[PDB]
Amino acid sequence: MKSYEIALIGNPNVGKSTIFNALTGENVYIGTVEKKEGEFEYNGEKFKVVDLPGVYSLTANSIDEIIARDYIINEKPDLVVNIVDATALERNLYLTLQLMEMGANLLLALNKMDLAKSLGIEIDVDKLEKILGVKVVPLSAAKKMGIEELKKAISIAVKD
Numbered sequence: 001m002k003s004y005e006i007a008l009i010g011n012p013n014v015g016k017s018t019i020f021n022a023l024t025g026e027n028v029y030i031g032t033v034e035k036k037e038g039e040f041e042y043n044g045e046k047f048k049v050v051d052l053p054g055v056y057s058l059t060a061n062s063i064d065e066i067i068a069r070d071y072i073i074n075e076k077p078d079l080v081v082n083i084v085d086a087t088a089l090e091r092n093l094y095l096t097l098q099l100m101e102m103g104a105n106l107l108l109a110l111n112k113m114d115l116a117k118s119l120g121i122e123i124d125v126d127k128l129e130k131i132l133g134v135k136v137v138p139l140s141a142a143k144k145m146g147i148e149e150l151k152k153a154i155s156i157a158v159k160d
């Protein structure tokens with residue numbers, strides 16, 4: 001079976017583990033010894049997933065930032081899934097710009113849409129997509145909503 005390599009990356013607390021469990025079925029109740037590698041199958045193909053340490057940027061200021069940056073550069077994931085918090089877009093987009101700059105094949109998972117909704121915050125996904133030039137997948141991972149959309153967007157993005 002054909003396999004692809006996928007990395008999850010994003011700010012602390014955005015829902016990386018929640019999405020990792022949702023995609024791969026690993027760590028059925030996280031936060032004891034969290035798995036950071038796993039896989040899922042979609043439309044006859046296999047997707048190996050790695051959950052990278054939470055970072056705010058990719059300079060060389062912490063162990064985690066060095067670990068994240070080395071993975072993208074040297075391991076060359078087929079797709080980087082940049083998970084962003086819908087309720088703190090400006091903060092998250094800093095990391096996002098650095099990922100674009102380094103030439104990563106990128107896909108944006110826009111999490112916590114349920115929180116945004118309940119706080120009256122509106123995100124124009126189609127407009128965000130047009131501006132960035134990157135595909136955007138709206139989801140609420142803790143409610144397990146938009147997970148199949150993410151699997152689908154991923155399987156298309158690895159070929160792009």
Ligand SMILES: Nc1nc2c(ncn2[C@@H]2O[C@H](COP(=O)(O)OP(=O)(O)NP(=O)(O)O)[C@@H](O)[C@H]2O)c(=O)[nH]1
Pocket residue numbers: 011012013014015016017018019031053054111112113114115139140141142143
């Ligand atoms: N409202 C809402 N909360 C969410 C959603 N996804 C995750 N959360 C919450 O956000 C918090 C962080 O979840 P987690 O997935 O562990 O984030 P993380 O990115 O792995 N954190 P870390 O950087 O420490 O590894 C948890 O309280 C989780 O319940 C979502 O879709 N909606």
Ligand SMILES: [Mg+2]
Pocket residue numbers: 016017018
């Ligand atoms: Mg985590």
